[PDB]
Design a protein around this ligand. Structure first.
Ligand SMILES: Nc1ncnc2c1ncn2[C@@H]1O[C@H](COP(=O)(O)OP(=O)(O)CP(=O)(O)O)[C@@H](O)[C@H]1O
Ligand SMILES: Nc1ncnc2c1ncn2[C@@H]1O[C@H](COP(=O)(O)OP(=O)(O)O)[C@@H](O)[C@H]1O
Ligand SMILES: [Mg+2]
Lengths: 175, 189
């Protein structure tokens, strides 16, 4: 019993538009693969997680116009929400060309939270740093996003580089 | 003085060792060492030798395929094994890379399912890193149980634990039939 992911994606253009206006951000929102089908029981559950990722992109990712110009970047930020099938799973991606997740900030927070000390933090790989955002209570919150995705028997990944932006990938079972 | 030494202090004995293991395992290997002058804490150098040997043996044994197998695959008859060290920020990064058969990801997934760590639906959504990370989970692999029969730690256990005792980190990257790359990051200190 599947339905097009458009049942999830449809309310986003409006919400992204309002969030950007409200945060004085200029964002061009692009949705791809809205016809991609997924279990209808996933529809309600996955909406909240995706909205949070979109909000993070507009809030923490896309920089104010003045800052983007200072970086030699396109004046308007780009936010892409896509869906597609990859074998036996539905792949959903949220990608922005914003400032990227501040990895030093994450390390500092992890240390203060008592999750690691200075010594071990110094050698963490970029991916190991980003994964701290998945720890329950670290942060709503990427930790809750990961938990909900997991409750759907899915998986989540994060990719982010300074000034390039951030891409969050969610994989849900194709059942 | 400074308690620092070029990593060559340990790298130096590998060329001959690799040459030997290569023939003892009946294989032809193109062994490349890079950045042997990279300096790091002497304690790290004295401790990292065991782990590196474990990774090199893994590459020659489980990775690089016999001449006959590589030709059948469409790869050069001789495999390549690269051991390098370099400075990166305030860390020293050591890599062991081969162009062998690669980690059997489907085998890991099937084992994870058999052990009940995940079901078929979840297995289908796992990312490459999540799959490979199972190699660092204690009590996972069956061979781990094999090596432990002799009262000794298995390769991944020894490598991971020795590295962590130095406050270092370790990651594994691998693609189907395209090889394996193990990266170790150690502090400068
Ligand atoms: N470079 C590489 N290429 C392909 N497979 C590799 C590899 N390094 C490790 N592996 C695989 O991962 C599994 C475990 O390696 P690990 O070093 O823990 O155990 P081991 O089976 O080699 C026995 P021991 O380490 O005690 O000799 C291996 O058995 C092999 O299948
Ligand atoms: N798209 C993004 N671009 C830049 N930074 C991000 C992005 N998404 C998340 N972050 C960073 O990761 C940290 C956590 O995100 P999250 O767990 O969602 O928490 P929150 O909105 O409550 O701070 C954030 O505090 C922010 O610094
Ligand atoms: Mg081994």
């Amino acid at each position: 019993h599947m339905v097009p992911i458009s049942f999830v994606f449809n309310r986003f253009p409006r919400m992204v538009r309002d969030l950007a206006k409200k945060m004085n951000k200029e964002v061009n929102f692009i949705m791809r693969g809205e016809d991609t089908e997924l279990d209808r029981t996933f529809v309600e559950e996955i909406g909240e997680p995706l909205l949070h990722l979109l909000r993070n992109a507009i809030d923490h990712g896309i920089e104010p116009k003045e800052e983007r110009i200072a970086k030699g970047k396109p004046p308007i930020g780009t936010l892409i929400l896509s869906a597609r099938h990859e074998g036996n799973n539905v792949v959903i991606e949220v990608e922005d060309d914003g400032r990227g997740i501040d990895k030093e900030k994450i390390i500092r927070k992890a240390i203060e939270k008592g999750l690691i000390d200075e010594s071990k933090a110094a050698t963490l790989s970029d991916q190991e740093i980003l994964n701290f955002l998945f720890v329950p209570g670290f942060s709503v919150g990427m930790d809750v996003v990961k938990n909900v995705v997991e409750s759907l028997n899915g998986s989540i990944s994060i990719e982010s580089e300074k000034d390039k932006g951030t891409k969050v990938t969610i994989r849900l079972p194709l059942t």
